[PDB]
């Protein structure tokens, strides 16, 4: 084998402790760059003029943040969707003031995670597996794309990307509620059904399988030792599990087919989260939650408030208070 | 392969209908988001200037021009948040554009009634609205039955492009597995990993 | 139960309704800053973590199946009473070990973990809400407030979020809490420029 | 920043005490007969 042939054999090698692969060839440097930039910025980045109004927001630990408050702050509203790599700045000081780390990090991250997904396919192919784990991973990934790329595109600025921080995340959420009434959007409700439901079925499945483990141990040892890695025989009794759950609700509401069950387990959270992601990604173009403001009117024409209108009042508080120095004109049009 | 391609095309169409006002004329599709934000800035620049404001020298609360400021490369642009949209271009705005961007003397002297009309129209037909088609910001009251065509087409095509990307992954991976002969599962008597050395 | 019992009345419990529940969420943000609460954060981690485990486990099983039939649709190639595992734990384990760095090797552990994560998450959130019954919130970082109080150039996403909370409270309180007879003159309402 | 001056010891003992408990248990597990 020549050098290229050997290299190809190593890259795609199934014997590497961590699979590399061709997707990995892109993934590794981008994720390393993104990670290093993120960590360094999170500790040491100076405040960033996120909203382009020469009002810099401090995101880093050394500039007065803790873990909950800390963030890598989104690039300046003055930049918008302009590509702002380090080399477009006259200096690192300028790059930092205008939030360059945000763009570097999110672009490398999105590239790297796309490659992570491809890499999941690739390894599944190398191991003779079915290929669709990566499709499940498409659910969280799309969501990241929604908040780091699609929303900024729709609104015309990366300053509207989700900040890389916990409280910044909350800021993004509150402002999103103010501007799109996301709670009242059916795609977000499907998202919620997705994660609540995902958790429910995770706990449920966990509990039923745990409930029907076959006795292989004594009381003075963990039941986990009752299973040996790679054993051929199933470690629990699915017939008993189904017997239980089928009586808990009713027979035909219970899975007796493990494959159908696990497919359901995969599909519910993945599809739901796909809808969450599409929710963010379509509210990115301002097709917003249901608006029932003043939907209920009495015979004279008096407005009769519903819970939607109270939501509306909260939303109003959010709208009027956010970015208190950024608006000169009465409507927030993007 | 075709699913991948169509997904890509879907996203491209989404951005096309969201930003482009040439093959998607605002006369027919409504203003773009950028167009409408710029149109608001234009509207109030006009209003306040009519009232006697010197819009070139008007300093906003932040220190930036209330009506007019510089882009990061120095071009004269509308100020406030619409600073993000300075790349917007439209037939109603361009006559006010000079070599260095928005021209203050043209603004002071050359704004025509049709421009005021157009800016007001687009400002008040911004592509914002609820799913039940209540026009405007999320806190707006019921009154106006409006969602911009730009929003319907962008949202629909993002959803479609995304699920087609999903379909691409599903079918490319299945085609690979089926071609290699394990789309139906692992051969119990020939499990590949069992013939591989342990990782540790 | 516990939350309204700690508050003035049942009035401030969630109302049984979709939009009402959303209102309950936004109230908790504006008044309790409930997102900032580490018990809620553990709740979130447990819910999203549970959904992650659900999805990843379902997909892993579905993509490490043994071929037990001739059908390209693989669901029929399972029998409830069969002794054998329907999917390969060994192959799954290698896959994730090479992809993610670690992998389950013990199915009993895997499934107990699937119980543990969302249940524990919800329980933590319950503890936090118990705190909120008494208005014992994680609302503020005192160091943050002292710094921001002395330094009007000091800004974090935390302070921005508090501005949002203050807006929520002032704009929603009169209609959300009609028994208080709130009258907030236009001039007292907190607002930024223009909006 | 005007942080709580006990936050350091609180965090340090919060990490160290159970971590140490676990290390004790692990290490005494390893040294048992194979």
């Amino acid at each position: 084998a020549n050098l290229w042939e050997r290299f190809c054999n190593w890259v795609t090698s199934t014997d590497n402790r961590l699979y590399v692969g061709w997707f990995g060839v892109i993934m590794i440097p981008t994720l390393l760059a993104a990670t290093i930039c993120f960590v360094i910025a999170f500790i040491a980045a100076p405040p960033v003029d996120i909203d382009g109004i020469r009002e810099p927001v401090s995101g880093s630990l050394l500039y007065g943040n803790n873990i909950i408050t800390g963030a890598v702050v989104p690039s300046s509203n003055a930049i918008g969707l302009h590509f702002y790599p380090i080399w477009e700045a006259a200096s690192l000081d300028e790059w930092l003031y205008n939030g360059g780390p945000y763009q570097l990090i999110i672009f490398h991250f999105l590239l790297g995670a796309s490659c992570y997904m491809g890499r999941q396919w690739e390894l599944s192919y190398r191991l003779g597996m079915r290929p669709w784990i990566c499709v499940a991973y498409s659910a969280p990934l799309a969501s990241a794309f929604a908040v780091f790329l699609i929303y900024p595109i729709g609104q015309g600025s990366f300053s509207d990307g989700m900040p890389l921080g916990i409280s910044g995340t909350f800021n993004f959420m509150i402002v999103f509620q103010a501007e799109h009434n996301i709670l009242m959007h059916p795609f977000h409700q499907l998202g919620v059904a997705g994660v609540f439901g995902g958790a429910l079925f995770c706990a449920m499945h966990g509990s039923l399988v745990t409930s029907s483990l076959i006795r292989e141990t004594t009381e003075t040892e963990s039941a986990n030792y009752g299973y040996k890695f790679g054993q051929e025989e199933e470690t629990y009794n699915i017939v008993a599990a189904h017997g239980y759950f089928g009586r808990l609700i009713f027979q035909y509401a219970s899975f007796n087919n493990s494959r159908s069950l696990h497919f359901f387990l995969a599909a519910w959270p993945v599809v739901g989260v796909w809808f969450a992601a599409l929710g963010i990604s379509t509210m990115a173009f301002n097709l917003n939650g249901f608006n029932f403001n003043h939907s209920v009117i009495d015979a004279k024409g008096n407005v009769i408030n519903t819970w939607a209108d109270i939501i509306n009042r909260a939303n109003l508080g959010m709208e009027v208070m956010h970015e208190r120095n950024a608006h000169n004109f009465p409507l927030d049009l993007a | 392969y075709s699913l991948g391609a169509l997904s890509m095309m879907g996203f491209i169409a989404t951005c096309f209908v969201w930003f482009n006002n040439t093959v998607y004329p605002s006369e027919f599709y409504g203003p773009t988001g950028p167009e409408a934000s710029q149109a608001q800035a234009m509207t109030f620049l006009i209003r306040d200037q009519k009232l006697g404001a010197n819009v070139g020298s008007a300093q906003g609360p932040t220190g930036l021009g209330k009506y007019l400021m510089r882009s990061p490369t120095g071009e004269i642009i509308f100020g406030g948040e619409t600073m993000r949209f300075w790349d917007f271009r439209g037939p109603w705005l361009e006559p006010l554009r000079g070599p260095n961007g928005l021209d203050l003397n043209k603004i002071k002297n050359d704004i025509q009634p049709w421009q005021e009309r157009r800016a007001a129209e687009y400002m008040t037909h911004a592509p914002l609205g609820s799913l039940n088609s209540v026009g405007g910001v999320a806190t707006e009251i019921n009154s106006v039955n409006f969602v911009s065509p730009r929003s319907w087409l962008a949202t629909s095509h993002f959803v479609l492009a995304f699920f087609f990307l999903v379909g691409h992954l599903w079918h490319a991976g299945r085609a690979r597995a089926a071609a290699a002969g394990f789309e139906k599962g692992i051969d119990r008597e020939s499990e590949p990993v069992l013939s591989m050395p342990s990782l540790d | 139960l516990i939350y309204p019992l700690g508050q003035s009345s049942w009035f401030f419990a969630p109302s049984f309704g979709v939009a009402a529940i959303f209102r309950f969420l936004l109230f908790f943000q504006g008044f309790h800053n409930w997102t900032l609460n580490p018990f809620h954060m553990m709740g979130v981690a447990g819910v999203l973590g549970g959904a992650l485990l659900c999805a990843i486990h379902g997909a892993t099983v579905e993509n490490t199946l043994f071929q037990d039939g001739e059908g390209a649709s693989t669901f029929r190639a399972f029998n409830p009473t069969q002794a054998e595992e329907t999917y390969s734990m060994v192959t799954a384990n290698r896959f994730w070990s090479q992809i993610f760095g670690i992998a389950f090797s013990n199915k009993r552990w895997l499934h107990f973990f699937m119980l543990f994560v969302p249940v524990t998450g919800l329980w933590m959130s319950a503890i936090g809400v118990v705190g909120l019954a008494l208005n014992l919130r994680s609302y503020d970082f005192i160091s943050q407030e002292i710094r921001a109080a002395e330094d009007p150039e000091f800004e974090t996403f935390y302070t921005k979020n508090l501005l949002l909370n203050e807006g929520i409270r002032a704009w929603m309180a009169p209609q959300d809490q009609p028994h208080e007879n709130f009258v907030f003159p236009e001039e007292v309402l907190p607002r930024g420029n223009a909006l | 920043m005007e942080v709580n001056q006990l936050g350091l010891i609180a965090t340090a003992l919060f990490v160290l005490v159970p971590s140490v408990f676990l290390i004790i248990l692990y290490v005494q597990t390893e040294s048992q007969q194979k």
Binding site: R17, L18, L61 | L199, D200 | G101 | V15
Partner: peptide
């Protein structure tokens, strides 16, 4: 001192990732 604490805990977590991956107890088929 806060920052030192936060970064320290983070670094401990990353090191933990390292040991948990490369120095895990190996899975063995019995």
């Amino acid at each position: 001192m806060e920052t030192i604490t936060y970064v320290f805990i983070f670094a401990c977590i990353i090191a933990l990732f390292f040991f948990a991956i490369f120095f895990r107890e190996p899975p063995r088929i019995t």
